[PDB]
Ligand binder design. Structure first.
Ligand SMILES: OC[C@H]1O[C@@H](O[C@H]2[C@H](O)[C@@H](O)[C@H](O[C@H]3[C@H](O)[C@@H](O)[C@H](O[C@H]4[C@H](O)[C@@H](O)[C@H](O[C@H]5[C@H](O)[C@@H](O)[C@@H](O)O[C@@H]5CO)O[C@@H]4CO)O[C@@H]3CO)O[C@@H]2CO)[C@H](O)[C@@H](O)[C@@H]1O
Ligand SMILES: OC[C@H]1O[C@@H](O[C@H]2[C@H](O)[C@@H](O)[C@H](O[C@H]3[C@H](O)[C@@H](O)[C@H](O[C@H]4[C@H](O)[C@@H](O)[C@H](O[C@H]5[C@H](O)[C@@H](O)[C@H](O)O[C@@H]5CO)O[C@@H]4CO)O[C@@H]3CO)O[C@@H]2CO)[C@H](O)[C@@H](O)[C@@H]1O
Ligand SMILES: CC(CCO)CCO
Ligand SMILES: CC(CCO)CCO
Ligand SMILES: CC(CCO)CCO
Ligand SMILES: CC(CCO)CCO
Ligand SMILES: CC(CCO)CCO
Length: 180
């Protein structure tokens, strides 16, 4: 893929929650559930704007708590998020530190979704007392996602993944070079 980013429609991921996604890396926020995806999958770097993950919708399913591996539920609900943001390698190595040298994070996962609290996704996805999970993701039509996109924050903002074909088909396009 352009830039050496690692971008696939379905796979295994870890999951955490974060807040403050009103000025996200794609340059448009959204009112439905949203997430940041790890940098290696996002397709950009801090400051460079939108990458090719932008606007794509994914069904996320948490099925394991790696910090308490004998917990077997209840988990949260499967949710559909729209990717609006970038979870950078910097400062977030445990979960978002996938790079060309180390394509899996500390939980052995090649992808990570950081689900934004601001529009409620994390409240549905994480059971009380279990704020970090592993499980699966699958790219789905954004017709399965509920919400509306926000206005552009800056020129070149992009959420065109919302109607593009599944990865590895492209949409917004990658910027720069994959983290190494
Ligand atoms: O006018 C000059 C030129 O501007 C071009 O637009 C600029 C724009 O001015 C600038 O504001 C914009 O900045 C983006 C930046 O590109 C993007 O990487 C950044 O993404 C952040 C995001 O806001 C955070 O939510 C996210 O938080 C993470 C935490 O940092 C992390 O610790 C962890 O908790 O995980 C969080 C995410 O889960 O970090 C992201 C990555 O840093 O957002 C900025 C604000 O939107 O950049 C654009 C593009 O360069 C314009 O295109 C051009 O035409 C014009 O001439
Ligand atoms: O960088 C990405 C993103 O991170 C967000 O912050 C994350 C952070 O990165 C994670 O490390 C953190 O993970 C914590 C879990 O949310 C939390 O549920 C888990 O709690 C454990 C607890 O530590 C553990 O000791 C406890 O064990 C109990 C057993 O389960 C019981 O059976 C037994 O009886 O008793 C023991 C002792 O109590 O289990 C629980 C559940 O597993 O701890 C993790 C480590 O602290 O999650 C954060 C939120 O997602 C950050 O918000 C974002 O800004 C950032 O972008
Ligand atoms: C203002 C939020 C969306 C409201 O629907 C953006 C994330 O903070
Ligand atoms: C200089 C940045 C914007 C600061 O608001 C973008 C490039 O990192
Ligand atoms: C405000 C929460 C639910 C609204 O019904 C999340 C949406 O931001
Ligand atoms: C990137 C925005 C930050 C808002 O807090 C400014 C440009 O719209
Ligand atoms: C950028 C487009 C993908 C082209 O196949 C999306 C059109 O909305």
């Amino acid at each position: 893929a352009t830039g050496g980013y690692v971008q696939q429609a379905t796979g295994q991921a870890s999951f955490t929650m974060y807040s403050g996604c009103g000025s996200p890396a794609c340059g448009k926020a959204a009112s439905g559930f949203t997430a940041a995806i790890n940098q290696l999958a996002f397709g950009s770097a801090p400051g460079l704007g939108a990458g090719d993950a932008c606007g794509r919708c994914f069904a996320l399913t948490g099925n394991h708590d790696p910090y308490s591996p004998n917990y077997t539920g209840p988990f949260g609900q499967t949710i559909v998020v729209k990717v609006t943001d970038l979870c950078p390698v910097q400062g977030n190595q445990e979960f978002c530190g996938q790079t060309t040298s180390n394509p899996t994070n500390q939980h052995g996962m090649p992808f990570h979704f950081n689900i934004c609290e601001d529009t409620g996704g994390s409240a549905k996805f994480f059971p009380s007392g279990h704020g970090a999970l592993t499980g699966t993701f699958t790219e789905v039509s954004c017709s399965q996602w509920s919400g509306s996109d926000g206005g552009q924050l800056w020129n070149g903002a992009c959420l065109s993944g919302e109607t593009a074909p599944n990865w590895p088909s492209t949409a917004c396009g990658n910027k720069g070079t994959a983290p190494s």
